[PDB]
Design a protein around this ligand. Sequence first.
Ligand code: BCL
Ligand code: BCL
Ligand code: BCL
Ligand code: BCL
Ligand code: BCL
Ligand code: G2O
Ligand code: G2O
Ligand SMILES: CCCCCCCCCCCC(=O)OC[C@H]1O[C@H](OC(C)(C)CCC\C(C)=C/C=C/C(C)=C/C=C/C(C)=C/C=C/C=C(C)/C=C/C=C(C)/C=C/c2c(C)ccc(C)c2C)[C@H](O)[C@@H](O)[C@@H]1O
Ligand code: SF4
Ligand code: SF4
Ligand SMILES: [Ca+2]
Lengths: 100, 105, 122, 101, 647, 281, 50
Amino acid sequence: KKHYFIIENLCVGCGLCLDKCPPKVNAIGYKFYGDVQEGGFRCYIDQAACISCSACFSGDECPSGALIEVLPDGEVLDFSYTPPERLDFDLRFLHRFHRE
Amino acid sequence: GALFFSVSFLTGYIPAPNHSAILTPLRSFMGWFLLIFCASIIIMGLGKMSSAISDKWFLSFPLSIFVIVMVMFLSLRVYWEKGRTTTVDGKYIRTTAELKEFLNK
Amino acid sequence: SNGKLIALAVGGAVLMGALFFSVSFLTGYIPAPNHSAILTPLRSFMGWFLLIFCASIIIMGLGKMSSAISDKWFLSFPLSIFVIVMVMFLSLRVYWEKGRTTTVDGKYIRTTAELKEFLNKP
Amino acid sequence: SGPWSGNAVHKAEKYFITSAKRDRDGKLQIELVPASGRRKLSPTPEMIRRLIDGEIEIYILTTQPDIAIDMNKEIIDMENRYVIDFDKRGVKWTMREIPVF
Amino acid sequence: YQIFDTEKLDDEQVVGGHLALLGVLGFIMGIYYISGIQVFPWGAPGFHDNWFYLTIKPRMVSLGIDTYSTKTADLEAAGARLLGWAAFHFLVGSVLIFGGWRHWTHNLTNPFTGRCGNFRDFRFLGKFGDVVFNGTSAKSYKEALGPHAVYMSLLFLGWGIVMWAILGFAPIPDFQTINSETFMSFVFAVIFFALGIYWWNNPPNAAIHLNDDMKAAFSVHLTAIGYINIALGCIAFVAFQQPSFAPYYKELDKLVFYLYGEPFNRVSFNFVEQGGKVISGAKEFADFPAYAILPKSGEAFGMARVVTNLIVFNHIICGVLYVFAGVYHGGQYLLKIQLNGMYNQIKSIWITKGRDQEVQVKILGTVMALCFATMLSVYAVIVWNTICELNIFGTNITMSFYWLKPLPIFQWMFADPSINDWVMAHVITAGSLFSLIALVRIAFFAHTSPLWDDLGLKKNSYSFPCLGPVYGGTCGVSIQDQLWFAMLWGIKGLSAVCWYIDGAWIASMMYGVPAADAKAWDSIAHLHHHYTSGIFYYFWTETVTIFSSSHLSTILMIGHLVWFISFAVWFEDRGSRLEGADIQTRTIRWLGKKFLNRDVNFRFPVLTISDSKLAGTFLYFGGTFMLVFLFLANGFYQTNSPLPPPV
Amino acid sequence: VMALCFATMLSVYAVIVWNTICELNIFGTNITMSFYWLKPLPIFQWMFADPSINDWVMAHVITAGSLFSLIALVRIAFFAHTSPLWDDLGLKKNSYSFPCLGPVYGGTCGVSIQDQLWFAMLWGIKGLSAVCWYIDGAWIASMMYGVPAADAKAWDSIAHLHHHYTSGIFYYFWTETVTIFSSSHLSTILMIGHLVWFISFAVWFEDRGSRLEGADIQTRTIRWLGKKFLNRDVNFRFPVLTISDSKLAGTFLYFGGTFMLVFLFLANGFYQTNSPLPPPV
Amino acid sequence: IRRLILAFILPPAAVMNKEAGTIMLTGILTLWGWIPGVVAALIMISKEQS
Ligand code: BCL
Ligand code: BCL
Ligand code: BCL
Ligand code: BCL
Ligand code: BCL
Ligand code: G2O
Ligand code: G2O
Ligand SMILES: CCCCCCCCCCCC(=O)OC[C@H]1O[C@H](OC(C)(C)CCC\C(C)=C/C=C/C(C)=C/C=C/C(C)=C/C=C/C=C(C)/C=C/C=C(C)/C=C/c2c(C)ccc(C)c2C)[C@H](O)[C@@H](O)[C@@H]1O
Ligand code: SF4
Ligand code: SF4
Ligand SMILES: [Ca+2]
């Protein structure tokens, strides 16, 4: 179903998702490579322990986008809702407000 | 508790005049324990406040602040300090010229 | 090209000096009992810059000290401080405080008894 | 104005290669989906143009029904770095949940 | 600390909360008025002087409610007047709190008729709303601006009537008396009436607000009102020092103020409080009853400038805090609209024009470059002046920036133009720039920063203490953390304000020091006013009098404790505290069980880094400014007699 | 260690604050409510000259500070790799200098050996300053002994002190700076030490992320300005100290800046006269 | 001629053509070193447009 995962490539090991995991579940854990300041520490979801409660992902807490949700049909969601894509331009008026 | 008064029995100290050698350590430890109790009450009561403060009060809490500050000033006047220093004779000094006059006295 | 970096830095310092001089003329102030109004603003600007420059070069040199420090500095680091400290002490004797500060006569006030006898001149 | 459109962490909109099936035997079953998760697209030539231009960023998850290894063009001289075509590059997101407790 | 969030409350709830707070504040005003009663209406001696009433005594005597007259007669009358006005404030505050409860509970049913009016649709005051509004603001704050302007016009009009009749100050044009405040009260009515009508007929538009904007409008208006407070502080400083205000602020110096906590007539140890009490022992100063609060002349205390400084710094601190809070809450709104995606959909300059990250970077870089330049200039000037006055490196005061007065075109702002005023202006600009670095970071880098958009990270939670040691450390990167840093940076501009208004010589750290040429500034710079000692020696001189007061000494100790307690939470110690608190829990458990069979099942709580930063900044600010209160409440202690040359 | 430290610290600090309150006569408490009767016992009096509450507070403050720093030293000794909490939370300390783990479990700042050393130094600043103020002749039993307010200047009379101590804790700064300001070099040390000490806050405070995010802006501003009005020049990155290096530098600055000035306390003078003042009747 | 005089009274109004950052900088310049410094800013930028 939900089957929330973490992209180890992008995790920064902040742990903002770990605190949301229910205390007994504790599926999310810390994996250390070395030299914490160099980014060795990372986040992993033990899929066996996960109970698809959505607390980790629905929190909107992942800064890197590593925390993803694979929908039952299958689609990776990096966020609960990404902002719409826009074609932007600076509206500078001609005469009155912001000329040129 | 009653350790400090035994300390006072030891640690030979010349008691200050007109103060009992027993009650002076009693007063000292009394104030010590009063400070400890006041700190404990402050910490635990503010913990309970943070745990219990919610949208349900919305005015009884400001009204509690109002009543406590009102009684602060009320105790300032009634119990702590009485009258604007008046004078042993009774005259009040309210100008700098009168204060200078009494300085000349 | 770092020539433009130094050009901009020296131009900025020169412009600071010129601005200080110009505003010193603008700001109406009695110069001093003796000192002039042409040199005093420049003395203040010299202090200003020398301070900023000394702090900047100290920061930069200590950063490069931390960058270049190695085991090969075994004798380079300690002895250097030694010499600088030595120089400092010598600079105290020959430049800053030239003597022991005896009286004008040269009586070498060196005990509290004679200090008491001295401070109470008749 | 570009960091505030879409997810702010991906300068180029990211497209995970979610589903691919060998049964259709054409590999058109490769079904790219953006991180937003609202368009089950396909690897069309326009998507190829976007990928080469750098506008998009196609990615692959490790924990999934296998997309196509050596069946969708693969470079294995180094660690595998799957490519739709040699000029393309599908950077595989690595996902170590099973190897670690 | 988020229970009364804007989202949690609707417009009627906010109306009711503000109304109930106005009532509470009216009760506080009555309390202060009663605290100001030196002699009771019944004859007996009254309350001593409190800063809470010495702050408003000038204004009260301006309105005739209080009197600077010193006889028991007419001071009894002033006390009766203060009691009457305090009772009026009490009852009106009761009514305001009743209305606030009704609005907060939405039970806007008339107790007499029972008709339940609608916040959305309501005729104002009856027929007046029909004449003017023709029907209420169906919705929208924009349609509410005009009605609020009309309400403020009616407030101005009512104050004009009250001062004309109740307080007996007729409307007279001349601006040297309270009478003009009546005149202008009517003027600003018509203005804030007419404009209101205009804004009712032609509403204004800033579409960022009006939509889901209790926080957004609150932020903008809080920043605006913070600048209003800063302007009010400057105006108060200028005006209260003008001759027209001397009858109400300079005449404080002629009075003697018995303030709580001031020196009390001491008594020997062998003292018995019976009858005359003379036989047992001797009181410190005779002619005053034992333990009585001794008189303090306003001339020495400088109560004119003390009260002026207290009011001015109150408004300045409140305004700076309000600016910082407005930028913070606006940053919270910005982050919300960035997360939900409305940021790109806003079509107003206040959001669109800084949409580009390039312009945000350029803005913050310009602010940072100006801050570096101005801070370096002022600090070089100050340290060089210190090097000169202390004669360090062989220097002397002649090399200091005594020549660097503000230009003749800018000396109007300053009574005695010297290098002190130059350093004041430039230090204020530099502190403003410093705090603006953090404020601009909140404004722009609320959801993503150029480092973070390069580093592939986004700021979501608006309170997250960090993202960890990734990239060498991500401490204090939320907008809340930037607000805390902005407050800790504005501490310094606010200090500069305090030290300037209390008479300090902030151009050098060691003015008035008994060393080298520190006491020569008055001769070389040709100063008229003898500024209070310099930045480092100002502590000493002001503590000469802080230490002489038991109450001010208590404040000193308490604020210092509060300040240094802040490091336990601000320092990078949270993990150490958590580990130690686990050890504390285990210690309590086993020690208690061995000492007492009862089990504990309780844990010592450790603040999160977010709460740690919150409490740490609160404590830092609290200690710092509870002590600035000592600086401003010791006395002005700046005399108009320059010190001769040291030699 | 924690319990002994809590007991000693709470008792001695309560003694100090109570003596301060009685000094100031705050809450109406005259000086006789103070612990003028707390003196070193006739068994341990020989360790001190003029035994009084100052000596008792000295001994207990030193014990409390030693046990305080010993909390961190013992944490270094034992909880170098695994702590009971870090074991329960299933985490390992793989380095002596690792700053933290992250915003996990509410924060994990300063859990390493190096950070515990820094906290040990910061805590032992108190014991060392107590030593300095005892040796230069201060009244550490109260905050404002010798203050010209209330009954404080009656201490010598109430405690029968044979020597006049320079001042209480808070008043010690003032009375011992009367002579620092009279000296130019000591004033330079004062200013420089305070500069160093408060600059320690830039790194010790939880602000590394802010400084990093701002150094990015500094780099970009340098490039843009060096390209715009300076012509055709762009390079250089503004470095920012890591949290480990930030903590190290902050501890160095803190310790030096506080002990750049303790030297001033000890180098301005003993100033502990042996003529006790009369009562302030 | 309107732009330069409006600039000498209202420099940021003159640089209104320029980017919002430049307009804010010119406003700050009015605030600090009013006229001389900010008049310098406006003349530099306007002459640069020329
Ligand atoms: C400190 C620096 C900033 C500041 C920083 C923050 C931060 C940080 C936060 C808020 C939050 C809020 N702020 Mg703010 N804000 C400032 C100024 C203001 C002002 C103003 C005076 O004009 C207002 C109206 C607000 C309004 C608000 C709300 C929109 C919101 C929720 C508050 C509430 O429910 O808290 C409930 C608690 C309160 C009532 C305040 C605490 C005071 C107590 C209850 C007062 C009475 C007791 C006693 C007298 C004093 C306290 C100490 C005693 C020992 C008990 N801020 C100051 C100047 N603000 C929070 C929010 O959720 O943001 C979305 C939040 O996280
Ligand atoms: C002077 C004009 C100021 C202003 C001054 C204040 C002050 C001051 C306060 C508020 C408060 C509130 N303000 Mg406001 N407010 C302004 C404009 C706005 C606007 C708007 C423009 O539409 C909005 C939406 C708000 C929003 C709000 C709410 C968050 C809150 C009222 C709800 C209520 O009382 O909860 C029900 C809550 C209660 C009645 C409990 C109150 C408890 C105590 C008595 C007060 C708590 C806060 C603190 C002690 C006050 C500190 C002031 C400092 C001394 C600087 N403000 C401007 C910027 N506003 C209050 C609030 O709750 O702050 C957190 C508050 O105290
Ligand atoms: C101090 C009193 C409080 C207060 C307390 C009450 C009480 C109590 C009641 C209401 C009722 C109502 N309030 Mg109210 N309310 C206040 C301010 C407001 C404001 C505002 C202008 O910001 C709004 C939007 C409202 C909204 C509303 C309406 C929905 C409703 C009246 C319907 C209507 O046709 O009435 C026409 C008149 C109104 C719109 C009232 C406007 C507010 C005036 C100032 C109330 C004054 C009451 C006071 C005792 C008399 C003094 C009059 C002197 C001339 C000063 N109130 C004032 C400041 N409100 C009333 C009700 O339900 O009416 C059917 C009601 O009984
Ligand atoms: C000027 C009158 C008001 C004001 C009214 C508003 C309004 C209205 C809005 C904001 C909003 C915001 N305000 Mg404001 N605000 C003021 C003071 C400030 C100060 C400050 C310390 O001076 C700061 C840091 C902020 C910060 C902020 C942000 C939280 C937010 C914009 C984010 C963004 O993306 O901007 C993008 C960046 C910019 C648009 C940069 C350019 C600035 C604009 C074009 C106007 C000012 C410059 C002007 C032309 C200068 C030259 C002439 C001089 C006037 C002499 N305000 C004063 C008190 N503010 C918005 C928000 O969302 O509120 C919650 C909002 O709706
Ligand atoms: C209730 C009484 C007071 C007190 C009264 C005194 C007095 C008075 C003196 C000391 C002395 C000492 N106390 Mg003690 N002491 C208190 C609390 C403590 C605590 C603590 C658990 O917090 C500790 C660790 C200490 C430790 C110490 C040393 C600092 C000092 C050196 C000799 C020694 O210990 O001799 C005794 C040593 C032991 C019995 C074993 C080790 C220490 C034990 C754990 C605690 C000793 C205090 C004990 C309660 C004293 C009993 C004597 C009373 C006068 C009846 N005290 C309490 C608050 N203590 C002496 C000192 O040097 O004075 C300058 C001294 O004369
Ligand atoms: C008055 C000031 C201080 C204390 C009081 C104190 C007390 C204390 N601290 Mg602290 N601290 C600083 C100030 C004070 N820290 C500073 C300025 C820094 C910046 C570096 C700092 C830093 C760290 C780190 C990094 C760690 C700790 C801990 C830790 C404790 C847990 C157990 C213990 O140590 O008990 C030993 C400590 C005692 C029980 C102290 C005895 C009470 C006192 C006599 C009186 C209390 C007065 C009161 C605070 C005033 C108002 C109260 C009321 C009226 C509202 C613990 C009770 C840590 C632990 O949990 O591990 C042991 C940990 O890891 N810290
Ligand atoms: C004298 C003491 C201080 C500075 C000097 C300074 C300088 C500075 N700081 Mg600081 N700081 C504190 C003290 C000082 N912080 C404290 C006590 C706290 C505890 C809360 C604190 C905290 C934060 C946070 C949280 C952040 C920052 C930043 C940030 C800057 C980058 C941007 C800027 O301000 O440029 C504007 C340029 C200036 C500020 C530099 C002009 C120098 C002047 C002439 C004083 C010279 C000082 C000394 C004489 C140098 C020795 C030379 C020789 C003897 C070896 C930046 C230059 C941050 C940024 O990068 O954000 C954009 C950020 O996020 N901080
Ligand atoms: C505390 C002293 C400052 C030191 C602060 C350090 C600066 C950052 C240093 C990096 C910090 C760091 O982290 O790393 C250190 C790293 O160092 C090294 O790398 C280098 C890049 C080579 C260092 C050299 C940098 C530079 C050349 C030196 C510094 C830059 C300089 C030149 C600073 C000074 C600039 C100036 C003087 C600023 C001020 C200039 C602007 C002013 C005054 C405005 C005037 C206003 C005008 C227009 C008119 C005014 C007016 C008005 C308004 C109205 C009316 C009237 C009448 C008037 C006159 C190693 O390689 C690495 O190993 C090591 O790590
Ligand atoms: S969905 Fe729930 S149980 Fe599963 S990893 Fe996320 S928070 Fe833990
Ligand atoms: S030191 Fe503390 S605040 Fe900084 S990144 Fe580590 S856990 Fe977060
Ligand atoms: Ca000494």
